[PDB]
Ligand binder design. Structure first.
Ligand SMILES: *[C@@H]1O[C@H](CO)[C@@H](O)[C@H](O)[C@H]1NC(C)=O
Lengths: 49, 49
């Protein structure tokens, strides 16, 4: 009860609601900041980066 | 003729130099959207410098 390795709804929303083209605040993958999402096509990223 | 008159040796001097006092204005204008990937002067300008 109330202590352990099996967590229930303690994690936040984690929504798929990317707001493109506007200035927002973000924390994705660990990095906090204030900026912009903007869609583009590029392919030097890998499936682990 | 019009008051936008450099000279030819002034052109050779003033084409190898990226950040003169007109490149700064035309790069600071380019901070609304990034529009290629990013710039460094926009990261400076949004941080007070
Ligand atoms: C400003 O942006 C436009 C399009 O985004 C580009 O064609 C131009 O070369 C840029 N100028 C500078 C000085 O970055």
């Amino acid at each position: 009860i109330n202590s352990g390795t099996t967590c229930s709804n303690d994690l936040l929303y984690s929504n798929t609601e990317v707001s493109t083209g506007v200035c927002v605040n973000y924390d994705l993958y660990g990095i906090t900041g204030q900026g912009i999402f903007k869609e583009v096509s590029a392919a030097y990223y890998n499936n682990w980066q | 003729c019009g008051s936008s008159s450099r000279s030819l040796l002034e052109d050779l001097l003033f084409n190898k130099v990226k950040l003169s006092d007109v490149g700064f204005v035309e790069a600071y204008n380019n901070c609304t959207g990034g529009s290629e990937i990013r710039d460094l002067l926009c990261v400076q300008s949004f941080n007070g410098i």
